[PDB]
DNA sequence: TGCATCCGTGAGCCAAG
DNA sequence: TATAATGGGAGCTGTCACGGATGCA
């Protein structure tokens, strides 16, 4: 099972992918809070707390209470290169784009 | 800024929009001429409608039609309906069209061209060649290198002069 | 003099007229009998130039002896016919008209 | 030979007449054998009835039309570059309303083209074929709304050009919207204009959950119908005066006008079945007794609401079901253009009716035919669907006629061609062939009519099934649409039958495509034949079941491209189709009744029938097809022969005794050969050329005109200035070449002089003339010579002059001369060969016979195909075709192996055993033992596990022969090929892609007007294209100088190219390029756009690239 | 938008 | 509509006719204005259609003749069940009309065709991308004019500089034009008979060289 | 190596009264085996005249001394009532396979 | 500040036609 | 040059994805 050519074009064109991965704007620590009917992930810093509301069935890659770098992925999925840029800087996007293109 | 408004509308040199007789003695001609002819008729009728002091409704209509003539000449299709030549669905080919696209001036004649001293034929394995060779049909070669052959034909005895050697391969 | 850059700028009415070799006053192309260019029309040799190398329209001047000369009987310069690819005409409008590139290319530069 | 034939399925019905889709449809549209008053309101009759009567005072009505006889027969039109056609007259009468004066007249409308017996046309002299269009059937559909899962879109769709698309959506705001001419408005309004009333709509639509409330708008029922109609008119024509008569006119034309809106008879029936209602006409509503009465809008609305609630018995529609896609055959396509031309004629009628003497007006004085003559001429000459006929060989013509395009006027644009369109929808079964289609952009958009398939009255494609009742397979054959087909369990044609009963506890069937194992109790129908699933071409492929679909596609299409060979052979392994195809394609001639054959000639066959009469069938001999292949018939009976009705009298092109002969049966070995068959290249034996296999006859046409010029006349003359009698040897007194002569490139075919123009002599001319004392003649050599790399034997000249009788040329033309030149084409290095399983390759090397691998009895193989072509391609059919062909080489028989009902391996091995005995017991008797080399090869075979250890030489050789393999000697050396090799008979064709047509080279030549760049293509002696990507190649190599040549000296730098040519002919290295002309063109075209482009030097100071010539 | 509807309107004024 | 002018162009030419009618109307005849206006409005529309509809402009009387020819041919086809020959059209045209005249009138009425006329049913071809430019000299032609000039000078050098210069003056290799014998004779300070005689001997010697070397023959054709 | 038929101009022809076309006739004549008894002989020109209902075989050639037709049974043409054939077929000595496009005899 | 919607622009090369 | 004549017709339709400007709550 592959993504192929379009994934390459999704990258060289720097397009925000449809099934995008939510990434942390900052550093922090994970607090899961899942109602039977709604779900959200909070990334809490030493005095800064960011909330990330996402649909119930989306996969995570964070076991609760882990330490994550700004721009790490919390959802499975493809990272928006622009969010990665704003969060983590040009070297990070360069790594990301090169590695994804080569994956294809 | 005002230069984005036109007073003198330039006209392209005629050879770049010719009126040619073809083999049969019939005439072919490029769409720009009908675009300019639209333009010039509407402009002239406007100069006359002004001289004869016509009402506002009429002068206004003429002015609108004049703008649209300029629009079709420059980028036909851009605003409104595209101008078609009578009894056809084909849009007329405007200067913007000449410029832009896979078929336009840049891509079609400027970033790539047809070329002289060139040929084409079917290929065939030929496993005897060495890596640096290819087999080339004689007749192909004779035409591909024709001027060199006129020269060398003259250097040896095979013809008196270039013009004779060229007559000799016709 | 070797070419090193290529500039592209807007064209003033005075520059368009400076390019021009004559207003094209009539919508005519070539005469239905002579098959020669009509005067003051889209192919007039008086504006855009001689059709045959060094030969004016009417006939009075037909050799390179006279170069640059403008014929008195027909108005056609005696130069290389090649210039019919290079000599701009012009048209003078009764009302000025918008250049649609600067109107419908959004965001409109005029607007 | 004996023709052993395999197969168990017996075929209840024969293949229907194969060009019926064309011949029938045209008949039906013309109704020309029908007496006028007996005609139906279809085809061009329907067009007439639609246009007429024409009113306004004066009325012009239409009684009837008639089609006279062709002014010239088909052959004559083909020669005289005419159109085979019929005169069209229409009896029309003028009536003045008041006066009652009725003056009547049969007025002539010009000519309509006639379809020939075989289903093609002749337009300005060339055979053309009108391809059937596939499109979405008119009707009412429900497709899901792609944004809003639980919402759906009703689409009401008319015929092309006979109405607007209408959509009915349930908005997120609750109100039901109708989209028409791209405007969304509340459907409520139109419902009101129909006479509807919240009473009636409440009782009809109340059931459905809360939906009906979104239809309740009190502000609408407030108005009488006229007020609602005017509200709608303002909503659809903003600003236009909402005058009462004008709004009734517009809305009527939008929704009820039978001369403006039109579903099909198909659109009608489909809506009837879908919404469970009955229509009156072919529109959406009517005007009765002064008001508007609904027909379709409320039924569609009810179905929409029920689909949205969830009511059982309502579903969306698979718009790619071949029940929702229909065919527009030739008659429908031509009629539509008829309808159009008639409308224009009607505008001209009303025009001349307004002004001019309103007492002295006859039908003749009111009817300009030219609108209609023009519309028809257009549709036949420049339509997208009017293709140049492909008559490469008979089969190519037939296949063309059975094509289906999704493209064309009123069809898909290549941009609008998604996946689902191109998919092999399940309902293509038995209707459209899943194999024959092009590889490329057009994949799945151009398809072929399946073999047993037929197009019904409504335009849908039907396929036949046997009826099965209580496990008996009747002979009652039902043709079904796919909507029909979806109702049944349908067993597979191969299910086993004792007698007429299903002898299998479990049987293989389809329900709605889905494959299913069922009991004969459940079986309602059964397939007619495997043949029923594929196109004719695909059906011509033996062992198709052993070939992957991708290469079967290539075998299918490539048959289209077979050149008729002077010694064509039917394949040693046929499918059974090969005879019917020659028949339906009108390849051959057949006996019309029982008879005795009177005379037999190169040119004619005369037959004396049972009525004592004499028929003289003349033979088309060496005629030039559209593609220049030779269409030529040969007599296949002799004086005295008794012949039954339908016995072969003359083989066509590519026919051998009435069998399709697209190629030759050659002896192949499947082995590598010193790279000469690398990557699909093919080796052949010189024997093939010696015995004239793969030799074909081609004719080119050469035309010339001498016309009247301002400067004097062109004339066809032998008296051509400055030529030697050397140049003129083969020219008759009038300047035309002599029948018989051999003509080579450079040779004159037709002389001609043209007058020189204002040739004011350059001083060098004056002095040179003086030195030589010869006046430069009035005229100059403009004769028609032979183009490079063309040539042959002149075989006819046609000459037409002005003043000759029957002859009138285009104005100014004095004379036309045609010269036909024929050539016998042997096979040559770089010509293309293919087989019927997609094996294709160019001929790369022709060894002399002594190098060819041979069998031990001294017999050379004809062709050596590389095995590496097989595994990747997965077309094992050719392999089996070879094994069988091995046996028929020694038994001396051909074969018929139906697809999916063919010779199985053990039967082929039976045959191979019989063959082996013929091939080896011969040698035993003639007194020779097993050769030493054969012992060595046997040893190698033993290590390969191909023979059993211990058996005898004869036992082991037979063991190999049974696997298709034979000991093979390398004729170069006499040593044996280290292993045994697959050798046998294969049917191989010479496709139309011969290198003689393709090789081309240009030193310098014609350039183009505006670009001053070289023209393109062989015919124009043009230059190759060095495009953007070639430029990239040169850029990435860093060959700046090579690159720069391509951009300047080698095209469109005028100074540079002239200078380069002179340097090369003088041995001087080539000058530096200057500015390419097309850049000067760009500068000027930008100036023409009021943009100043300005070349600059480093000091930012202008550089003039027009060398002064453009500044004052 | 449609330069003929425009003129039919302006005509509809006088 | 249809006749070669846009609806709007028709309207504007009709308005020109409206202006004419207004300035020429006489209310005392008691006619409504519409009756007089329609004459001039028709006249103006028709003069426009005649004067403008052709890329190759045709005088209005000739257009009238061409339309008469069109309609006569249509009548003839409507009664002949086929198209008329040049002879049938000339007959129905009256006297003064023969077949050659009908044919010349047809030839003159031929309207040109678009260089951008589509070839094929893709978007990547233009009629007249197949029209070769006949005007600009070919590179062979040009090379051949250079080789001529050079070999003519080669031959002229084998004359005395006066005979060479006299021939160059006389044929136009110097200043474009041909000179008279009286001019060359006044320039070299001899009698016009004398310059005619040295020209004759220059040509005699050039003919002799061209006998003995054959270096100019091939250029002549 | 070369054939003249009277009233025939080129290879792509028919002859009235003859079932076969010139192409088939030359295809037949290709086969024809001609033995030269005298060793110094390079070329012969067989003459043939024939007519009337008759299956002209190779026997029907005019005999020439020091020349023997080894396959006289070889069929050549089928002629029906009033069909006339008159050929001059030239047979050369030579080696290898030399195609018509290369000797033009 | 956030969305939905709308208009314009682009969608492989060569070959023959 | 004079009866009177007073507001048009053809739309044409199986894409699709993006970017960037307008349009709303
Ligand atoms: N429309 C087109 C048609 C052809 N081409 C070019 O021609 C080749 C056809 O390959 P192919 O599939 O016909 C055979 P090959 O590549 O050797 O693999 P196989 O033999 O194992 O099947 C392509 O690979 C392209 O280079 C193109 O660019 N666009
Ligand atoms: Mg034959
Ligand atoms: Mg007469
Ligand atoms: Zn002059």
TrEMBL record, chain E:
It comes from the Bacteria. It is found in: Cytoplasm. Interacts transiently with the RNA polymerase catalytic core. Belongs to the sigma-70 factor family. RpoD/SigA subfamily. Sigma factors are initiation factors that promote the attachment of RNA polymerase to specific initiation sites and are then released. This sigma factor is the primary sigma factor during exponential growth. This is RNA polymerase sigma factor SigA. The gene is sigA.
TrEMBL record, chain F:
Keywords: Cytoplasm, DNA-binding, Metal-binding, Sigma factor, Transcription, Transcription regulation. Residues 181-200 bind DNA. The keyword Ribonucleoprotein does not apply. GO terms for cellular component: cytoplasm. Mg(2+) 11 binds at residues 215, 218. A motif (Interaction with polymerase core subunit RpoC) lies at residues 9-12. Residues 1-55 are annotated as: Sigma-70 factor domain-2. Mg(2+) 4 binds at residues 90, 94, 97. Mg(2+) 3 binds at residues 90, 94. Mg(2+) 9 binds at residue 121. It comes from the Bacteria. Mg(2+) 6 binds at residue 94. GO terms for molecular function: DNA binding; metal ion binding; sigma factor activity. Mg(2+) 7 binds at residues 94, 97. It is found in: Cytoplasm. The keyword DNA-binding applies. Residues 180-206 form the RNA polymerase sigma-70 domain. GO terms for biological process: DNA-templated transcription initiation. Mg(2+) 10 binds at residue 124. Sigma factors are initiation factors that promote the attachment of RNA polymerase to specific initiation sites and are then released. This sigma factor is the primary sigma factor during exponential growth. Interacts transiently with the RNA polymerase catalytic core. Belongs to the sigma-70 factor family. RpoD/SigA subfamily. This is RNA polymerase sigma factor SigA. The gene is sigA.
């Amino acid at each position: 099972i592959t993504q192929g050519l379009p994934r390459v074009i999704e990258l060289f064109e720097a397009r925000r992918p449809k099934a995008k991965a939510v990434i942390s704007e900052i550093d922090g620590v994970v607090r899961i809070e899942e109602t039977e009917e709604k779900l959200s992930v909070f990334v809490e810093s030493e005095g800064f707390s960011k909330e990330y509301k996402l649909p119930k069935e989306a996969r995570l890659l964070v076991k609760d209470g882990d330490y994550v770098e700004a721009g790490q992925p919390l959802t499975r999925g493809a990272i928006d290169p622009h969010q990665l840029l704003e969060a983590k800087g040009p070297e990070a996007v360069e790594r990301y784009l090169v590695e994804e293109i080569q994956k294809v | 800024p005002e230069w984005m408004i036109l007073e003198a509308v330039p006209v392209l040199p005629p050879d770049l929009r010719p009126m040619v007789q073809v083999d049969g003695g019939r005439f072919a001609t490029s769409d720009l001429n009908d675009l300019y002819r639209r333009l010039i008729n509407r402009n002239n009728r406007l100069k006359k409608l002004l001289a004869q002091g016509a009402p506002e409704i009429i002068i206004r209509n003429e002015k609108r039609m004049l703008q649209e003539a300029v629009d079709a000449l420059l980028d036909n299709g851009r605003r409104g309906a595209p101008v078609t030549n009578p009894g056809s669905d084909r849009p007329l080919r405007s200067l913007t069209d000449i410029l832009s696209g896979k078929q336009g001036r840049f891509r079609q004649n400027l970033l790539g061209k047809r070329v002289d001293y060139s040929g084409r034929s079917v290929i065939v394995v030929g496993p005897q060649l060495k890596l640096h060779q290819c087999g080339l049909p004689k007749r192909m070669a004779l035409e591909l290198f024709k001027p060199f052959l006129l020269k060398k034909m003259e250097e040896k005895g095979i013809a008196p002069n270039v013009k004779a050697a060229r007559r000799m391969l016709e | 003099k070797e070419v090193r850059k290529v500039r592209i700028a807007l064209a003033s009415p005075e520059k368009i007229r400076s390019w021009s070799y004559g207003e094209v006053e009539k919508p005519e192309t070539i005469n239905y009998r002579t098959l020669k260019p009509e005067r003051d029309g889209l192919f007039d040799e008086r504006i855009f130039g001689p059709i045959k190398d060094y030969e004016c329209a009417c006939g009075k001047y037909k050799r390179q002896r006279f170069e640059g000369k403008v014929c008195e009987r027909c108005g056609v310069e005696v130069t290389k016919s090649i210039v019919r690819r290079y000599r701009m005409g012009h048209i003078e409008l009764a009302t000025p008209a918008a250049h649609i590139w600067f109107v419908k290319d959004v965001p409109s530069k005029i607007g | 030979m004996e023709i052993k034939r395999f197969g168990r399925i017996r075929e209840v019905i024969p293949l229907p007449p194969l060009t019926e889709i064309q011949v029938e449809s045209y008949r039906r549209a013309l109704q020309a054998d029908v007496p006028p008053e007996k005609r139906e309101n279809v085809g061009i009759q329907a067009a007439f009835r639609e246009t007429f009567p024409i009113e306004e005072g004066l009325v012009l009505d239409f009684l009837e039309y008639r089609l006279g006889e062709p002014p010239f027969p088909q052959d004559e039109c083909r020669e005289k570059d005419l159109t085979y056609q019929a005169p069209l007259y229409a009896r029309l009468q003028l009536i003045h309303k008041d006066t009652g004066l009725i003056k009547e007249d049969e007025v002539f409308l010009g000519h309509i083209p006639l379809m020939t017996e075989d289903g093609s046309f002749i337009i300005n002299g060339a055979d053309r074929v009108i391809v059937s269009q596939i499109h979405r059937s008119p009707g009412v559909y429900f497709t899901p709304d792609p944004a809003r899962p639980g919402r759906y879109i009703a689409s009401i769709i008319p015929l092309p050009k006979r109405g607007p698309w209408i959509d009915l959506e349930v908005e997120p705001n609750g109100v039901v919207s109708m989209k028409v001419n791209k405007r969304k408005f509340p459907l409520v309004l139109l419902l009101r204009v129909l006479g509807y009333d919240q009473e009636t709509l409440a009782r009809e639509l109340g059931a459905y959950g809360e939906l009906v409330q979104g239809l309740m708008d009190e502000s609408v029922f407030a108005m009488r119908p006229e007020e609602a109609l005017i509200r709608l008119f303002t909503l659809l024509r903003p600003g236009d005066p909402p005058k009462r008569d004008k709004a009734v006119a517009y809305v009527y034309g939008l929704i009820a006008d039978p001369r403006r809106y039109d579903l099909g008879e198909a659109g009608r029936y489909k809506a009837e079945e879908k919404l469970g209602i009955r229509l009156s006409g072919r529109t959406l509503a009517r005007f009765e007794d002064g008001e508007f009465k609904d027909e379709v809008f409320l039924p569609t609305l009810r179905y929409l609401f029920a689909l949205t609630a969830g009511v059982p018995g309502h579903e969306v529609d698979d718009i790619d079901h071949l029940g929702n896609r229909r065919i527009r055959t030739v008659g429908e396509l031509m009629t539509d253009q008829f309808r159009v031309g008639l409308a224009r004629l009607a505008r001209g009628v009303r025009e001349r009716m307004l002004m001019g003497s309103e007492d002295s007006l006859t039908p003749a004085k009111l009817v300009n035919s030219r609108p209609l003559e023009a519309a028809i001429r257009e549709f036949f000459s420049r339509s997208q669907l009017s293709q140049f006929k492909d008559e490469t060989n008979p089969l190519s013509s037939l296949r063309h006629k059975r094509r289906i395009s999704a493209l064309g006027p009123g069809g898909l644009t290549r941009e609008r061609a998604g996946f689902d369109v191109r998919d092999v929808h399940r309902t293509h079964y038995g209707r459209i062939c899943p194999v024959e289609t092009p590889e490329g952009a057009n994949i799945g958009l151009i398809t072929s009519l399946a073999a047993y398939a037929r197009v019904d009255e409504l335009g849908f494609i039907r396929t036949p099934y046997r009826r099965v009742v209580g496990g008996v397979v009747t002979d009652e054959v039902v043709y079904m649409t796919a909507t029909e087909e979806d109702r049944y369990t349908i067993a597979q044609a191969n299910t086993p039958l004792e007698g007429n009963r299903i002898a299998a506890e479990r049987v293989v069937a389809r329900r709605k495509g889905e494959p299913v194992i069922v009991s004969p109790e459940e079986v309602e129908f059964m397939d007619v034949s495997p043949k029923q699933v594929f196109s004719v071409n695909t059906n011509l492929i033996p062992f198709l079941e052993h070939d992957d679909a991708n290469r079967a596609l290539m075998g299918s299409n490539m048959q289209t491209q077979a050149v008729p060979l002077i010694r064509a052979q039917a394949p040693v392994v046929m499918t059974g189709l090969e005879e019917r195809v020659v028949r339906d394609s009108l390849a051959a001639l057949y006996a019309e009744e029982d008879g005795e054959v009177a005379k037999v000639d190169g040119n004619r066959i005369v037959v004396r029938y049972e009525d004592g009469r004499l028929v003289e069938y003349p033979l088309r001999r060496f005629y030039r097809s559209n593609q220049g292949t030779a269409l030529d018939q040969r007599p296949r009976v002799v004086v005295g022969q008794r012949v039954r009705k339908g016995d072969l009298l003359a083989d066509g092109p590519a026919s051998e005794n009435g069998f399709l002969a697209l190629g030759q049966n050659v002896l192949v070995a499947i082995m590598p050969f010193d790279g000469y068959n690398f990557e699909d290249a093919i080796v052949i034996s010189e024997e093939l050329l010696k015995r004239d296999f793969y030799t074909s006859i081609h004719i080119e046409r050469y035309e010339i005109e001498a016309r009247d010029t301002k400067l004097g006349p062109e004339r066809i003359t032998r008296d051509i200035p400055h030529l030697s009698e050397a140049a003129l040897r083969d020219l008759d007194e009038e300047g035309v070449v002599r029948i018989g002569a051999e003509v080579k490139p450079g040779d004159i075919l037709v002389g001609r002089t043209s007058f020189k123009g204002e040739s004011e002599p350059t001083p060098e001319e004056r002095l040179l003339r003086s030195i030589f004392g010869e006046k430069a003649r009035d005229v100059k050599d403009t004769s028609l010579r032979v183009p490079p790399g063309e040539g042959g034997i002149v075989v006819r000249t046609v000459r037409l002059r002005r003043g000759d009788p029957g002859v009138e040329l285009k104005p100014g033309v004095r004379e036309v001369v045609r010269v036909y030149v024929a050539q016998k084409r042997k096979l040559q290095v770089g010509d293309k060969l293919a087989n019927r399983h997609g094996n294709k390759g160019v001929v790369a090397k022709i060894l002399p016979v002594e190098d060819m691998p041979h069998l031990p009895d001294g017999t050379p193989v004809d062709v050596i195909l590389n095995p590496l072509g097989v595994p990747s391609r997965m077309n094992l059919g050719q392999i089996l075709e070879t094994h069988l062909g091995l046996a028929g080489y020694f038994l001396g028989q051909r074969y018929i192996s139906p697809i999916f009902d063919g010779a199985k391996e053990p039967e082929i091995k039976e045959l191979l055993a019989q063959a082996f005995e013929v091939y080896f017991g011969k040698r035993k008797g003639e007194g020779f033992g097993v050769d030493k080399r054969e012992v060595e090869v046997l040893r190698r075979a033993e290590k390969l596990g191909l023979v059993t250890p211990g058996k005898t030489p004869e036992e082991q050789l037979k063991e190999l022969f049974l696997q298709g393999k034979v000991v093979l000697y390398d004729g170069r050396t006499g040593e044996p090929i280290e292993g045994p090799i697959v050798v046998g008979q294969m049917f191989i064709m010479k496709l139309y892609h011969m290198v003689e047509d393709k090789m081309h080279a240009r030193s310098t030549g014609p350039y183009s007007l505006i670009t001053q760049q070289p023209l393109g293509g062989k015919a124009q002696f043009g230059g190759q294209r060095f495009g953007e990507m070639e430029v990239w190649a040169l850029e990435a190599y860093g060959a700046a100088h090579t690159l720069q040549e391509m951009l300047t000296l080698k095209s469109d730098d005028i100074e540079g190219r002239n200078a380069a040519y002179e340097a090369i002919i003088k041995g001087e290295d080539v000058p530096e390029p200057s500015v390419p002309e097309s850049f000067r063109v760009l500068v000027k075209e930008l100036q023409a756009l009021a943009l100043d482009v300005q070349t600059l030097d480093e000091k930012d100071n202008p550089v003039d690239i027009f060398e002064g010539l453009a500044s004052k | 938008s449609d330069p003929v509807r425009q003129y039919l309107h302006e005509i509809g004024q006088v | 509509t249809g006749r070669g002018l846009s609806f709007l162009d028709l309207i504007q030419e009709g308005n020109q006719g409206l202006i004419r009618a207004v300035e020429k109307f006489e209310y005392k005849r008691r006619f409504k204005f519409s009756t007089y206006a329609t004459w001039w409005i028709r006249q103006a529309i028709n003069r426009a259609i005649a004067d403008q509809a052709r890329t190759i402009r045709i005088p209005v009387h000739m257009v009238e003749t061409i339309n008469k020819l069109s309609r006569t041919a249509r009548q003839l086809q409507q009664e002949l069940g086929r198209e008329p020959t040049y002879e049938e059209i000339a007959e129905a045209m009256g006297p003064g009309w023969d077949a050659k005249r009908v044919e010349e009138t047809l030839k003159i009425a031929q309207e040109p065709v678009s260089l951008e006329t589509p070839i094929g049913d893709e978007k990547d071809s233009f009629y007249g991308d197949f029209i070769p430019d006949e005007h600009l000299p070919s590179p062979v032609d040009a090379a051949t004019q250079s080789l001529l000039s050079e070999e003519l000078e080669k031959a002229l050098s084998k004359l005395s500089e006066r005979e060479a210069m006299v021939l160059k003056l006389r044929k136009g290799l110097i200043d474009g034009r041909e000179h008279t014998l009286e001019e060359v004779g006044a320039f070299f300070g001899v009698t016009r008979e004398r310059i005619r005689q040295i020209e004759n001997k220059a040509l005699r010697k050039l003919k002799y060289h061209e006998s003995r070397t054959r270096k100019l023959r091939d250029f002549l054709d | 190596t070369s054939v003249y038929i009277e009233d025939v101009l080129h290879e792509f022809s028919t002859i009235p009264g003859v079932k076969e076309d010139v192409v088939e006739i030359i295809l037949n004549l290709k086969e024809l085996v001609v033995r030269f008894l005298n060793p110094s002989l390079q070329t012969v020109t067989l003459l043939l005249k024939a007519e009337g209902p008759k299956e002209v075989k190779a026997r029907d050639f005019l005999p020439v001394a020091d020349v023997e037709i080894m396959n006289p049974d070889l069929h050549i043409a089928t002629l029906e009532e009033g069909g006339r054939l008159n050929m001059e077929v030239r047979v050369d000595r030579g080696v290898g396979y030399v195609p018509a496009e290369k000797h033009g005899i």
